[PDB]
Design a binder for this molecule. Structure first.
Ligand SMILES: N[C@H](CCC[C@H](N)C(=O)O)C(=O)O
Ligand SMILES: [Zn+2]
Ligand SMILES: [Zn+2]
Ligand SMILES: [Zn+2]
Ligand SMILES: [Zn+2]
Length: 415
C-alpha cells in the first residue's frame, strides 16, 4: 500500500487546520470504500490542513476481489505473530496512525444489510453494519478532538440530510470496545484511540449499488471534514449520477511498464500476445494510472488489469526482454514527418508511414502484407479491425523488435 497526501498548494498552510488520516480497502471486497478514497484523491482539494489517504490497505486482496487473502487484516492490530504475511504492512499502518501529525482517523467499510438498534428482520437488525457511523467509545481523553460522540452525531446529521431512500438512514454505533468487544479490540480504530487519535469508521451498506455506497462514503468524509474544520473543494456535484460518471471515467488510463497509456474503459475483454517484461513477477511490473486503485494480477494463464474489483481486460502475456535502447521512431503522420517517442500515442486523421530502420523490425498489429511493416503507407481501411485494443476499433498497436528483444510500442488512434 501507498499513502497519498492531499495538501494545500502552500506548504505552510498544512499546520493551519487539523490532519485526517483516511483509510479504506482493508477488506478487498468492499469497493465502496476504495472507490470513495480514489475519487477523493482524484477530484477534491484540501485548502488548509492535511488529509493523508491510504486508498487501499489490502491491495493484494482487492486485486482478487477477496475479503482478505491472509485472513482478516482488520483483526491484526493487537496480538500478531511476526511470521504473519501482513506483519510488515500492519507496522506501516500503525506507524501512519500514530504519527504526531495525525489528529483524526476515518476508516471506510462496506457491510451487509442495514443496521438498526433493535431487531426488525434479517436485513435490518443490530447485528448488521450497513449505513452506520461507528465509534469505539464516546470520548478519547488526550486527543486534539476528544468528543467522538459529538463529532459522530453531527456527521450522521449531515449524511442524513442527503438520503436517497429513507431506509438508508444512518445510525450511530458505539461499540464500547474497551468493555470487552473482543473482536473490535483487534481492529484498526481501537488501535487509533489508544494512540489518542479521534477515530471513526463509516460503513455503507452492501445492499446498495456501488455508486450509492460511494455517495454515502463521500458524505461521511465531507461531514467529518466539516467537523474538523478542514476546508475543501471538489470539482463535481455530489449526487449518485455524478459519482457513477466519475467511477466510469473514460479519461482513465493505465501505463504498464514502458508501454503507451491504454484507456481503462472499453478495451476488448482480451488482449492477445501482449508484451510484458520477462523474469519479472507481476506485482513488480510498473503500472501507473490517473486512478489510485489500478493493478495487475495473475489469473491462470492471463494477467488481469484491475480497476478496484472491476476487470478491465485480460492480458494474454508475451514475456520478452524489454530492450530500452529505442527512444523514438521516424513516422510520417498525415503526410508530415515527425519523430514519435516510443511509449506514446499518436493521432491519425488519414494515414501513416513508418520509416525503415536498420536493425529494427516494425509489426503493425492488424496490418499484414516476423513481419516487417515499415515502408508501407497505411490507412484505416488497411486494418483488420478485430486487432484493435478498443471496442471502438480505433486504437492499434505498433510493436518494434530488435530480435529477439522488444524495443517498444507506439499506439495509433484514428480520429
Ligand atoms: N464491520 C467492521 C467494523 C469496523 C469498525 C471499526 N472498528 C473499524 O475498524 O473500522 C469490521 O468488522 O471490520
Ligand atoms: Zn475531477
Ligand atoms: Zn470491512
Ligand atoms: Zn449538506
Ligand atoms: Zn528524425
Amino acid at each position: 500500500m501507498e499513502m497519498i497526501e492531499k495538501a494545500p498548494t502552500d506548504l505552510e498552510d498544512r499546520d493551519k487546520a487539523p490532519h485526517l488520516l483516511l483509510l479504506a480497502g482493508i477488506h478487498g471486497d468492499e469497493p465502496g470504500g476504495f472507490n470513495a478514497t480514489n475519487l477523493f484523491l482524484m477530484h477534491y482539494s484540501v485548502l488548509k490542513g492535511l488529509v493523508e489517504v491510504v486508498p487501499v490497505l489490502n491491495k493484494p486482496s482487492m486485486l482478487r476481489n477477496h475479503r482478505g487473502l491472509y485472513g482478516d487484516m482488520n483483526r491484526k492490530f493487537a496480538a500478531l505473530d511476526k511470521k504473519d504475511p501482513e506483519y510488515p504492512t500492519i507496522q506501516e499502518i500503525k506507524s501512519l496512525i500514530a504519527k504526531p501529525n495525525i489528529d483524526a482517523v476515518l476508516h471506510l467499510h462496506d457491510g451487509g444489510g442495514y443496521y438498526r438498534p433493535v431487531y426488525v428482520d434479517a436485513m435490518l437488525n443490530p447485528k448488521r453494519w450497513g449505513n452506520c457511523f461507528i465509534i469505539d467509545q464516546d470520548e478519547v481523553k488526550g486527543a486534539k478532538f476528544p468528543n467522538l460522540l459529538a463529532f459522530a452525531n453531527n456527521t450522521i446529521e449531515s449524511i442524513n440530510a442527503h438520503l436517497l431512500h429513507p431506509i438508508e438512514e444512518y445510525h450511530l454505533k458505539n461499540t464500547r470496545t474497551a468493555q470487552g468487544d473482543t473482536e473490535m479490540q483487534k481492529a484498526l480504530t481501537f488501535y487509533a484511540i489508544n494512540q489518542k487519535k479521534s477515530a471513526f469508521a463509516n460503513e455503507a451498506s452492501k445492499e446498495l449499488p456501488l455508486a450509492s455506497r460511494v455517495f454515502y462514503h463521500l458524505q461521511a468524509i465531507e461531514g467529518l471534514l466539516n467537523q474538523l474544520n478542514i476546508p475543501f473543494k471538489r470539482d463535481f456535484e455530489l449526487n449518485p449520477s455524478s459519482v457513477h460518471a466519475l467511477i466510469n471515467d473514460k479519461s482513465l488510463w493505465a501505463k504498464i511498464s514502458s508501454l503507451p497509456k491504454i484507456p481503462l474503459f472499453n478495451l476488448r475483454p482480451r488482449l492477445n500476445h501482449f508484451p510484458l517484461p520477462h523474469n519479472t513477477k507481476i506485482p513488480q511490473i510498473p503500472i501507473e494510472s490517473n486512478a489510485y486503485i489500478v493493478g495487475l494480477v495473475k489469473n491462470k494463464q492471463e494477467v488481469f488489469l484491475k480497476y478496484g474489483n472491476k476487470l478491465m481486460t485480460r492480458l494474454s502475456p508475451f514475456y520478452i526482454e524489454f530492450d530500452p535502447s529505442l527512444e523514438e521512431v521516424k513516422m510520417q503522420i498525415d503526410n508530415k514527418d515527425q519523430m514519435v517517442k516510443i511509449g506514446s500515442v499518436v493521432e491519425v486523421k488519414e494515414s501513416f508511414y513508418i520509416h525503415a530502420m536498420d536493425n529494427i523490425r516494425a509489426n503493425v498489429i492488424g496490418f499484414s502484407v516476423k513481419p516487417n511493416e515499415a515502408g508501407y503507407t497505411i490507412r484505416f481501411k488497411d486494418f483488420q479491425k478485430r486487432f484493435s485494443l478498443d471496442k471502438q476499433e480505433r486504437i492499434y498497436r505498433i510493436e518494434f523488435y530488435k530480435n529477439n528483444a522488444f524495443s517498444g510500442m507506439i499506439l495509433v488512434k484514428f480520429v
